[PDB]
């Protein structure tokens, strides 16, 4: 039934946080969801320190999409470097009262953060939902 | 960590890379330091240069990298100060090594200034010898010139809180020997109304053409030499000094129009120092008129040297003409006639209302607030113009509330903070980040509070008074309970207290609405608490528990608070009945007031004497209390010691004279008592003799003359005739007769009516 | 043209004008009338002996003075009608009115005051006008020195500024009309403001010094008071001819300065140098042959539809290559063949299309050597660039040319003194 | 199809030129100042043989010792060597040469561009999967922290990485060879600006007879770069006063400093947050001429000005004959 | 900054103000006094005090107002209203020149001192403080206790003061009044000096 499959896919996108079981979008557009899904796969894989597969998928699924859109590939390639830096009593007293910090005894990537916000999951699921509704 | 081949490669593999730099501070590679900064008086001259280059490269970290590395960085810097033996042999090392070492020392002083450098005299001796021998004889080399430049830069930074003569001589010789190459570029044509080269008139409102210095080394040398010479030269006696010359003054005026920003700034500083330092120079408005345009134009150049600050100089000029000759401010008129006052006010309004602030914007706003307070110091025009906004008072209350909240948070968390911060920073704690901001707001409020119309129509709020009382109480309590933070955290709060008491002392005066409010909420109790503190009253003793507090707060200057406390008490008793008098005397007894009478600060003495005047002002009882509380020779000694040429001392003298006036009116017994004493009659005689021709002693003032005439008038049945005859014999009839010819109508009329009454009674 | 001539020029004319592209005409005038002509004081003395330096003498004696530095004393103590003859076409004096309505000193500068024995304004204008296609900045100053003793200690009754050249009863009755751009000195208002722009400045007073300047790059008229520069007052005023203009009530009196024999108070040279620097920054921040001009037909120039005519630039490398070819040709022309051979060697060494430059240079060198051999055994295309650049700058100044497709964009070509700035 | 305002003929243009051509002589149809321009161009571009011969022709050379002194003073050989190394492709050696001959101060931005060009050079050398990993490691170690200071540097980084992952447009541009020449010219100009003051001092202090080819004495130059802005404290605004347009307390719209304890001993001024005014004015006219336009071959900028003048004449319907040869 | 004998900070004055045929009571209490001795540019008021009157309209037995006062010293504060500056603080003291002259001439001291003749001879004057008479103007600001009965106070006075006896004469002026409403005051007596100082 239409509603059952729609609900299952929406839950897999929202409840779980994995792209697989999206094969419909993978093999049926024939009319921006494909590029968005591939970019989301790239970022999701690069969130873990895995690189080789990220390079392979970048060369395989995002290389043909260069003629139309070019800036998003630039942002992805920049993230490929900047991922290691963008993502993650006494001191509190000093910060709140004096705006000063003690040394530790040892003797503006807003765009990239926007590429890592979890709201991307919601907007991707929303785009899939809208396309699926308007196509059926 | 070995021969030059390794060090050169390491240095060439460490340029601009912060990662390897911060890696070298990790444990496996720290062994390089044991050889890097252990430099003996041997091992070639190439090895020393390589080691110094490596040290300079490693210590080049951006602030977040410094935070990452930690205290090992500052340990390295301290080892550079304390265990390097190159400063001692400055005259014997090679020139290039000296240059590299001075550059390293500059960086170290720029990154970690608190650490003490113990070897300044060696560098001063080396600098003096080097410049006096090599430079002035033109047998110099490139590295020596650059070394002199670096040494001047290093000497400029010192805080400073016989060799001075040698240094001043060397600096002046530098200045002359470099500037003499450019004097022939001065040009100025002018027209004077009644040949050439007479230079008869240089009040022509114009300044010569710009003077351009091609050589960059000459630019740097001239600028830094002028700055340091400005630092030293006033402590050097002699005649025909550089500052007083005319050709040099013209040279600097021409330099004002140059291209180098440092040149313009140092020219401004050299031209403006005499107003703050030299006396009577303030009556030279022509030079200010011809200078001010460039001081204003200096606000727009972006890269400014750290030793230049247009805000501070402009504020200092305004404060000078406010303090010395109010009701006429040539700076304020010159600025108001040419639209720049309005620009300053508009920029203040813009900065007050930014969407998001930080430290720099907070400091800019503080500066603007201070300058706006300077505008409204002695002119009702700007008071009303600023008050027409009806939004400043909200921000004033917001700032005061913020400081109160911060102080409350600190006092609540006292025990935990002391427990967790007593081993490392036992008595070294930074001050609260808000001190300057609230200080500026309090200055602005104090400036506003001088106009009675504003006190009666637009400042007639209760929130202001409540906030002032809260700040006073909280600051004094913070002094009482948290004396473990030392002087660095304590001095700003005592300054705040001194400012806020002075701001209060206007609200509490008569014909002001909020006097009843302040009396209801009990300012007298707070002042009574503050006046018995051994930290303030020096004629008391400390208990057995406060020793730590006393040693923690021994070297703090506290006299503004005492003067303003006595000021408030004076204003509380101005034109009041005996009920309020006896109430305040019930709270604060006479003993404290008499205890503040021998303070080593002149302002405290003045305020104590004025309060004594207002206390005995029309009171038959408090005069008896004061007479019992001691007898008269003290007043004569005070009037003999005090210098009438000083403003505060003159105020004290007038206070004592009017104390005598009030003393000589309670009863006939007091009249005879004050007539009997003979010395005071000698002081009156010495006061009255002074005239226009003889204006040396007591400055030929009129208020003192009126006070003495009032004393004589109050001195008036056969006993009265006897006193009249005694006054005639003592030499007063001739004095009052000769007073008829004075230059002020008041003393003439008082003298003629007194003389008529005296003759009529005689 | 010894340095004595330079000293005479610097002493005669206003300083800020010699730094503009109008100094060519002044040099031309002086060279035409050259017949009448440390050591700086000597030249000043020579000028004073026969010229303008010295003393009107009844009550308000004036005398002119030069400053003279004694360098030797410093190091010892501290060490270890002429302009009528010259034809000077810029304004230099006020103009006496035919009707006896105002008295001005014989100089026309030293003192101007409306005639008391003759309330209606007394108005006048400078003797010469301002050509609109020769200058870049003009600036004169006034100093009021008497008030009606009724208005205020800080309020006058003067209208000073410029008047648009080709009615006057309106000027006499009110103070101005539709053709006057000035700064009314009684209410602090800009003449004919009428745009809610009544917030410009305050009225001036007794000893204030006021400058009324016009800038031809923006096309604006501005005023300054006591040294500080108030902003632009009127904008978009190109292609107009103006004349200095003053109007006084029978109580006031002024003293003018046009910059001939007195220093200004505003420091106009700095304000001019800022604009000069802005212009300079704007300007400067096979396919390499200069063949015959193709757009000549039948002798008359015809234009194409292409936007640009010179496509040379440093991005494509065409400009350096053309410059190298030109330098080699200039070297060949005027002796200096070994220098050209060395230049060819350096060009060969540096390169790792330039081969065309190398081949062309070597061919030219071989031809010149062959001709030299023929000449010995028998018994300029680069100056034109500098000359034509000067001529084209002069032409662009002569006919008022637009900035960029607009009569309001700044005309940056005006702020270039080619000889004094680029070549030196 | 026709100009319209003024179409100069050949004779009219010749007369127009000859009207003012006479002014060239009495400032220094011949141009007496062109030999000095030729010498300046020959020295600035580090053409050793041409500079030597031209200096000899003007009388500044009398033997081989003066040749050595000239070549040492103006650093012609070393600058040519650095330029040649950068052009050839070897760049780390160029950095080593710069550090050795001149000093570390030359590099302690141009270093970022040099590191980039090194990255492109090694990429190009590789094209004659672990390779990508090694280059990612290299870039992440060396260039990331420098690139984290502005925005356009980032754009450079992801342009490089998009090229790297590529097996287009605006990429063949960055893969072209002319980038090497542009970088080399930039380095040459930077070195000239670096070593000018020593040349001035050596000419002045020593009683040398050599000429100052850069920024002749009858001018003014400086090494700094200052900015002048009118949207700040001045008297150019009307007599109108704005007012507060906010109500939120300042404390509601608001760390990094470090607190250090000391250890007669001398202390120095603390310069922590003293340039507050410069960073605060940014939330509310520059000396290009003197500071940045002596440091180019004067003939180059004369050519630039000539081209601009010809175009400006064309736009405004004024027709003048061109220059032929 | 100078204060004289009879303009001391706390010195009373009593008398009457004659309107129509009636004359109401009056009382003046000085509060603050200071007069410049040299060049003056600032706009701080020279005198300020209270002007309590009683016996006015039946709506209130007595009304008290606070008033500020500027003295005339022939430099930047000349006799007429033209010589004064144009400031919002001073603009309440200004009226046409003819009415100023007509009001000044009615004082038997302004005449004894002597259209454009007065302005011309003003500059000859010297040291206004060493004079038998001092001329000044007073203007009301607001109500004393309130900070009400149909009485307007948007006019100003024309005070003249005799220094040797302490007499104060003057006329009230406003556009919509009888144009001659006069008042006379006496010292109304003092042997002690309670003094204050603003900070």
Curated annotation (Swiss-Prot), chain B:
Record's GO cellular component terms: cytoplasm; GID complex; nucleus; vacuole
Principal location: nucleus
InterPro entries per the UniProt record, alphabetical: ARM-like, ARM-type_fold, ARMC8/Vid28
Subunit structure: Identified in the GID/CTLH complex. In the absence of stress, the complex exists as an inactive anticipatory complex (GID(Ant)), composed of VID30/GID1, the E3 ubiquitin-ligase RMD5/GID2, VID28/GID5, GID8, and the RING-like subunit FYV10/GID9, awaiting a substrate receptor to form the active E3 ligase complex. When cells are shifted to glucose-containing medium, the substrate receptor VID24/GID4 is induced and becomes part of the complex, named GID(SR4).
Keyword Nuclease assigned: no
Ranges of the ARM repeats in the UniProt entry: 452-491, 512-553, 578-617, 631-665, 669-716
Locations listed in the record: Nucleus; Cytoplasm
Gene designation per UniProt: VID28
Gene disruption phenotype: Negatively affects glycogen accumulation.
Keyword list, A-Z: Cytoplasm, Nucleus, Phosphoprotein, Repeat, Ubl conjugation pathway
One record GO biological process: ascospore formation
Protein name: GID complex subunit 5
Homology family: Belongs to the VID28/GID5 family.
Transmembrane segments: none
Function statement: Component of the GID E3 ligase complex recruiting N termini and catalyzing ubiquitination of proteins targeted for degradation. GID E3 is regulated through assembly with interchangeable N-degron-binding substrate receptors induced by distinct environmental perturbations. Required for the adaptation to the presence of glucose in the growth medium; mediates in association with the substrate receptor VID24/GID4 the degradation of enzymes involved in gluconeogenesis when cells are shifted to glucose-containing medium.
PANTHER family recorded: ARMADILLO REPEAT-CONTAINING PROTEIN 8 (PTHR15651:SF7)
Upper taxonomic lineage: Eukaryota, Fungi, Dikarya, Ascomycota, Saccharomycotina
Swiss-Prot record, chain D:
SMART domains: CRA, CTLH
Keywords: Cell cycle, Cytoplasm, Nucleus, Ubl conjugation pathway
Source superkingdom: Eukaryota
Signal peptide positions (record): none
Domain LisH: 30-62
Location of the protein in the cell: Nucleus; Cytoplasm
GO BP terms, alphabetized: negative regulation of gluconeogenesis; proteasome-mediated ubiquitin-dependent protein catabolic process; traversing start control point of mitotic cell cycle
Cysteine-cysteine disulfides: none
Domain CTLH as annotated: residue spans: 75-128
InterPro entries, per database record: CRA_dom, CTLH/CRA, CTLH_C, Ubq-SigPath_Reg
Any single GO CC term annotated in Swiss-Prot or TrEMBL for this entry: nucleus
A Pfam family annotated for this UniProt entry: CTLH
Subunit details: Identified in the GID/CTLH complex. In the absence of stress, the complex exists as an inactive anticipatory complex (GID(Ant)), composed of VID30/GID1, the E3 ubiquitin-ligase RMD5/GID2, VID28/GID5, GID8, and the RING-like subunit FYV10/GID9, awaiting a substrate receptor to form the active E3 ligase complex. When cells are shifted to glucose-containing medium, the substrate receptor VID24/GID4 is induced and becomes part of the complex, named GID(SR4).
Function as written in the Swiss-Prot or TrEMBL entry: Component of the GID E3 ligase complex recruiting N termini and catalyzing ubiquitination of proteins targeted for degradation. GID E3 is regulated through assembly with interchangeable N-degron-binding substrate receptors induced by distinct environmental perturbations. Required for the adaptation to the presence of glucose in the growth medium; mediates in association with the substrate receptor VID24/GID4 the degradation of enzymes involved in gluconeogenesis when cells are shifted to glucose-containing medium.
Miscellaneous: Present with 639 molecules/cell in log phase SD medium.
Family: Belongs to the GID8 family.
Name of the protein this chain belongs to: GID complex subunit 8
Organism: Saccharomyces cerevisiae (strain ATCC 204508 / S288c) (Baker's yeast)
